[PDB]
Design a protein around this ligand. Sequence first.
Ligand SMILES: CCCCNC(=O)c1ccc2c(c1)NC(=O)C[C@H](C)N2C(=O)c1ccccc1F
Ligand SMILES: C[S@@+](CC[C@H](N)C(=O)[O-])C[C@H]1O[C@@H](n2cnc3c(N)ncnc32)[C@H](O)[C@@H]1O
Ligand SMILES: [Zn+2]
Ligand SMILES: [Zn+2]
Ligand SMILES: [Zn+2]
Length: 427
Amino acid sequence: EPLKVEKFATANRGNGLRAVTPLRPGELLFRSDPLAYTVCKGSRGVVCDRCLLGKEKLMRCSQCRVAKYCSAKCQKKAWPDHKRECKCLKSCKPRYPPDSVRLLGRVVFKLMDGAPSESEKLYSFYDLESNINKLTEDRKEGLRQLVMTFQHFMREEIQDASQLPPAFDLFEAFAKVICNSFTICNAEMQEVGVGLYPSISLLNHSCDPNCSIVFNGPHLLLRAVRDIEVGEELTICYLDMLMTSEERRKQLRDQYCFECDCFRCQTQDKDADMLTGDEQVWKEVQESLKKIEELKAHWKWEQVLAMCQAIISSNSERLPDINIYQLKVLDCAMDACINLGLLEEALFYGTRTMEPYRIFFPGSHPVRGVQVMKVGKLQLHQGMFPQAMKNLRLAFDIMRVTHGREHSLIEDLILLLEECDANIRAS
Ligand SMILES: CCCCNC(=O)c1ccc2c(c1)NC(=O)C[C@H](C)N2C(=O)c1ccccc1F
Ligand SMILES: C[S@@+](CC[C@H](N)C(=O)[O-])C[C@H]1O[C@@H](n2cnc3c(N)ncnc32)[C@H](O)[C@@H]1O
Ligand SMILES: [Zn+2]
Ligand SMILES: [Zn+2]
Ligand SMILES: [Zn+2]
């Protein structure tokens, strides 16, 4: 069709997107490649720099020796967007720049040297929100340091403003990046990358949204996850669902410079359940998760598992599985076990997440769709067919809404459903 969405000017939250026509759950609203993107710090050399797929088979750029790739095709295609950054990268090894700086380098190369980008159809990098009049002095110091890091990293390819676009202010561009960066997760919901998607950046936040985004490599799909009326603002949740209203407050302040007075934030919706169990215990668990989550972002599965087991099967006092810190521990342990092939133990943690995930991810949410598929997949390969089929159908009922036929993972689920169904049919 023409578009199901259009940019408009909201009353109190700058620009927004709104429905042009009524929308149903699962309808594809928009799709976009990035303006610019980069692999994350902790997944560097663990995933293809370009398609963001994992492998043990990864060849690597001998020029800079920082880029890794899954294929000759991926190395070659990533050359135009990695030609200019190439020199700068080698030229500063091994104190590597923060992701935000590498990301902005690619933005600049792309605005200088690229044709207009399809990702900027509804809204461009130039139009993005900076919140400059809301930034705290502490935030500004932080952005100054990013500007100086950028001028250093980029010295070879960029010495002055004629090499940057028309009047382009680097302080403002980092301001834009802070509140318009998308985290790119792979099919298994692990963080692998960071990109800008300027048309998608019109979406304002809601702690109970009507839309969802999902990624297939660097490609982004925006889908409705509820019914939406003509004229209704389109929204997505910018944050992890496993957070309390206080945690959301801090993050929405610090990164996005706004205050949320939605129903959930006004009522502290779910907050008491999330923090059930003994406070001294969940305090330490939340402390240890810093490290467990760091190890995870670096794919260090045996170490993740060791630390999770010391919590889950601790000799000292334990937490309910509905406690968010406990829950995040169980999830990391599950993922560790999957990636280490300890499938019975993976299933044990996975099944325990099921009921909390039902509660903390209401309606249709891609994170729940994927977790349910994962558990269903584990059961399937232990011959637990009736319980598998149950979970695979549930995953399909979520992911037909959240991922849809345009996302290749749905094809994988379809194969699992046909397999499980074969088994039952014959039994
Ligand atoms: C510019 C304003 C948008 C900021 N937000 C996002 O970029 C975003 C949020 C949540 C995401 C993703 C991206 N990425 C995905 O692949 C979808 C899944 C649902 N999702 C996560 O699970 C997630 C949860 C908390 C932290 C980071 C995460 F990636
Ligand atoms: C990705 S942008 C969203 C588009 C933005 N409103 C614009 O005008 O370009 C993120 C910024 O939008 C604003 N924003 C998003 N959700 C909001 C909300 N629920 N209430 C108020 N402001 C919000 C904040 O300025 C935030 O830093
Ligand atoms: Zn690749
Ligand atoms: Zn290179
Ligand atoms: Zn809220």
